[PDB]
Amino acid sequence: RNFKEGSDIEAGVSLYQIDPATYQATYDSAKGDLAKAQAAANIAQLTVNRYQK
Amino acid sequence: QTVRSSFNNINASISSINAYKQAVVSAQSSLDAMEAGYSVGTRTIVDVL
């Protein structure tokens, strides 16, 4: 729990931090793919730039 | 014969240059094709060589 029970809480405020294991892990998932996704476009743009010249 | 011998030669000779002269042009950009492709490094330098 992030809070003192009965207390006054702001909106969008973290209250209970829940195990983000499968999640932080999961978050890693798209991360590499993002890392890998961008990787492809990297070359592609790397190519396009060349072809441009 | 000799009259017709070389008179052909020169003309065919003419055709020669026109081919290679183009052909030079062929290699010419061909070189250029390389350098840019190497300049951008899309390709090796060896090719340019």
In order of A21, B1, B15, the CA distances from B10 in angstroms are 86, 14, 8
Declared resolution, Å: 5.9
**Which residue numbers of A have CB closer than 8 Å to B's CBs?**
47, 49-50, 53
Backbone angles phi, psi at A11, to 5 degrees: -70, 160
For the residues of A1-53, what is the DSSP string, one character each? Answer: --S-TTS---TT---S----HHHHHHHHHHHHHHHHHHHHHHHHHHHHHHHH-
Given phi > 0 = left and psi -120 to 50 = alpha, else beta, which region is B41?
Answer: left
Instruction: Give the integer Cα–Cα distance in Å for A45 and B36.
Output: 17
Over A38-51, what HEC string results? Answer: HHHHHHHHHHHHHH
Tokens 């003309």, located at residue: B11
Q: With the C-alpha atoms ordered B40, B44, B45, B49, is the resulting torsion angle positive or negative? A: negative
Partners of A44 on chain B (C-beta within 8 Å) are: none
Partners of B40 on chain A (C-beta within 8 Å) are: 49-50, 53
